[PDB]
């Protein structure tokens, strides 16, 4: 699990969104596994506005942060699950590293800020949903 808190916005994995997230829906994209909901309290996470291909992610299944090299956001084929049938997920970045389903929501960060959140895994590859192109999260 895990979310990004910025301004009056909360960003979560779309497959993990709650009834309160859907009741205060701002934007959601199934193709991206992303959902943004509105909040009463103000968030203070910083979003990165860059094209860094290195960073650090939080892995709840090991209680560890890991440095990773990751690909640029792209259309990557994602196997079927209880949440989605087999599809291409857009704005996806892959890295060689450990992940388990419950690690979805863990933040990926560079020197500039929050890059995205864990959203896929398997075969020793972890996939992160990019958020750097969502310029509106800051206004
Ligand atoms: C980080 O997740 C994993 N890591 C290792 C093994 C397995 C996983 C689970 C995983 O990839 N997904 C399940 C939940 C929805 C996902 C999606 N965006 O379509 C796919
Ligand atoms: Zn950066």
Swiss-Prot record:
Organism lineage string: Viruses, Riboviria, Orthornavirae, Pisuviricota, Pisoniviricetes
Organism this protein belongs to: Coxsackievirus A16 (strain G-10)
Assembly: Homodimer.
The protein's role, per its UniProt record: Cysteine protease that cleaves viral polyprotein and specific host proteins. It is responsible for the autocatalytic cleavage between the P1 and P2 regions, which is the first cleavage occurring in the polyprotein. Also cleaves the host translation initiation factor EIF4G1, in order to shut down the capped cellular mRNA translation. Inhibits the host nucleus-cytoplasm protein and RNA trafficking by cleaving host members of the nuclear pores. Counteracts stress granule formation probably by antagonizing its assembly or promoting its dissassembly.
Protein name, entry field: Protease 2A
Catalytic activity, as annotated: Selective cleavage of Tyr-|-Gly bond in the picornavirus polyprotein
List of catalytic residues: 15 (for protease 2a activity), 33 (for protease 2a activity), 104 (for protease 2a activity)
Protein residues bound to Zn(2+) 1: 50, 52, 110, 112
Residues of the full protein shown: 869 to 1007 of 2193
């Amino acid at each position: 699990s895990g979310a990004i808190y910025v301004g009056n916005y909360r960003v979560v994995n779309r497959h993990l969104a709650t009834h309160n997230d859907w009741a205060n829906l701002v934007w959601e994209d199934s193709s991206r596994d992303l959902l943004v909901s509105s909040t009463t309290a103000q968030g203070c996470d910083t979003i990165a506005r860059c094209d860094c291909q290195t960073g650090v992610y939080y892995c709840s299944s090991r209680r560890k942060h890991y440095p990773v090299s990751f690909s640029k956001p792209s259309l990557i084929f994602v196997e079927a699950s209880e949440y989605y049938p087999a599809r291409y997920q857009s704005h996806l970045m892959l890295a060689v590293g450990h992940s388990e389903p419950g690690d979805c929501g863990g933040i990926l960060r560079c020197q500039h800020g929050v890059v995205g959140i864990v959203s896929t895994g398997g075969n020793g590859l972890v996939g992160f949903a990019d958020v750097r192109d969502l310029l509106w999260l800051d206004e």
